[PDB]
Design an enzyme around this catalytic site. Structure first.
Site, short mmCIF file in Angstrom:
data_model
loop_
_atom_site.label_atom_id
_atom_site.label_comp_id
_atom_site.label_asym_id
_atom_site.label_seq_id
_atom_site.Cartn_x
_atom_site.Cartn_y
_atom_site.Cartn_z
N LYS A 215 -2.33 -5.95 5.07
CA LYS A 215 -1.01 -5.91 4.53
C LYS A 215 -0.18 -6.04 4.80
O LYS A 215 0.60 -5.66 6.35
CB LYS A 215 -1.71 -4.69 3.60
CG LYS A 215 -1.99 -4.81 2.86
CD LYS A 215 -2.22 -5.13 1.09
CE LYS A 215 -2.99 -5.09 0.37
NZ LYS A 215 -3.09 -6.15 -1.21
N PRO B 123 0.73 -1.13 0.04
CA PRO B 123 -0.05 -0.18 0.01
C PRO B 123 1.18 1.24 -0.33
O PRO B 123 2.03 1.14 0.42
CB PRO B 123 -0.96 -0.20 1.42
CG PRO B 123 -1.25 -2.14 0.97
CD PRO B 123 -0.10 -2.55 0.69
N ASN C 136 -8.46 10.24 -0.08
CA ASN C 136 -8.83 9.73 -1.23
C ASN C 136 -8.01 8.45 -1.21
O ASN C 136 -7.21 8.56 -0.15
CB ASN C 136 -8.23 10.40 -2.38
CG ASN C 136 -8.84 11.96 -2.51
OD1 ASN C 136 -10.33 12.19 -2.64
ND2 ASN C 136 -8.31 12.90 -2.67
N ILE D 229 -3.70 -2.11 -2.96
CA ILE D 229 -4.68 -3.18 -3.97
C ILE D 229 -5.27 -4.42 -3.09
O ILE D 229 -5.48 -5.22 -2.58
CB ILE D 229 -4.25 -4.60 -4.70
CG1 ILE D 229 -2.85 -4.11 -6.35
CG2 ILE D 229 -4.33 -5.69 -5.32
CD1 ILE D 229 -1.41 -4.65 -6.07
#
Ligand SMILES: Cn1ccc2ccc(-c3cn(-c4ccc(O)cc4)nn3)nc2c1=O
Ligand SMILES: Cn1ccc2ccc(-c3cn(-c4ccc(O)cc4)nn3)nc2c1=O
Ligand SMILES: Cn1ccc2ccc(-c3cn(-c4ccc(O)cc4)nn3)nc2c1=O
Lengths: 114, 114, 114
Positions: free
Chosen positions: C32, C1, C97, C64
């Site tokens: 993650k 990430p 975001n 992802i």
């Protein structure tokens, strides 16, 4: 909304009032509350457009809605106009990425909008 | 297209011709006209990768088309190669976000590309 | 990430350990692996939120998978909590975001994740 402009223009050439002007003009253009529009200007950047280091700008606008074909054309005229008038950047040397964000994909105030 | 690289490598380590090389190499790799390629390099950043502050880079490539499975692998080989050779950044400490942008969501020269 | 935070807070007000804390907290919230989490903090920025220059932050998280309604609400609570406690930024002056990236659109180590 969130508006970011990165530019090779020097910091001293960003006028007083520019962030506030962007905030008010984007509130008018998007219809969103000015209280919740964020603006960010990043001068003095190492960047080129078409291989040239003449003044240029790389920008983004994110919003939940108020993003689309006709609206984005209008925002581009507004924002290129402001960058030309205030920062002396030609409109042929400005790129703006527009993002229509899903309400679930914007964090704010400990949560999102969905 | 728009290519951005943020890195913790110091400014003095970025070669003078780096922006021009990125422009030319991206035009060849994407097939896009060089006069429309914008590049931006941001050194001296405060970043970590895996909790370590060894050299690293966080990048993005936006393009209207020319984005896809095999193409992006090729761009990554090109761009990681340049970051390794020019900035001494290990490829396993580089991330690149690829964006296939709709032409209606890319502003330029007072309008959009749509 | 990939997690990025841009802020008008000055560099000297970013604590020692902030990047490491972000990395560890993101690994816990997302599941993650921390060796693959990249974090980037950009202080001293010229930005406003609602026209005001009080402390604010504009952020992004790319991953992802692990992106969705409930998850993004959880990340927003976590990240606003850290920005409030560590950088003294009110949660109502933070935007994040979130991007659920296709693995084919994430470059790393001379290739992509798909
Ligand atoms: C009526 N009303 C009231 C409050 C409000 C408060 C916030 C918003 C709002 C914020 N975004 C946004 C900001 C940053 C991003 O990176 C992406 C999206 N989009 N909409 N909209 C409203 C709104 O429409
Ligand atoms: C054939 N032809 C001719 C002219 C042209 C002219 C421009 C482009 C073009 C521009 N972008 C782009 C730039 C900045 C962004 O932030 C996102 C996308 N992608 N493609 N493409 C072409 C093109 O493909
Ligand atoms: C189970 N496993 C193992 C290894 C791994 C290794 C890497 C990742 C991974 C990396 N991203 C990412 C990084 C930067 C971006 O700009 C966008 C996305 N998302 N996931 N995930 C895994 C993972 O989920």
């Amino acid at each position: 909304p969130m508006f970011i402009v990165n530019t090779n223009v020097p910091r001293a050439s960003v006028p007083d009032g520019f962030l506030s002007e962007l905030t008010q003009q984007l509130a008018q253009a998007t219809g969103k509350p000015p209280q919740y529009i964020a603006v960010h200007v990043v001068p003095d950047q190492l960047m080129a457009f078409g291989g040239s280091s003449e003044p240029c700008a790389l920008c983004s606008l994110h919003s939940i809605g108020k993003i689309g074909g006709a609206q984005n054309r209008s925002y581009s005229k507004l924002l290129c106009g402001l960058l030309a008038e205030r920062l002396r950047i030609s409109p042929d040397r400005v790129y703006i990425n527009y993002y229509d964000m899903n309400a679930a994909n914007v964090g704010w105030n400990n949560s999102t909008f969905a």
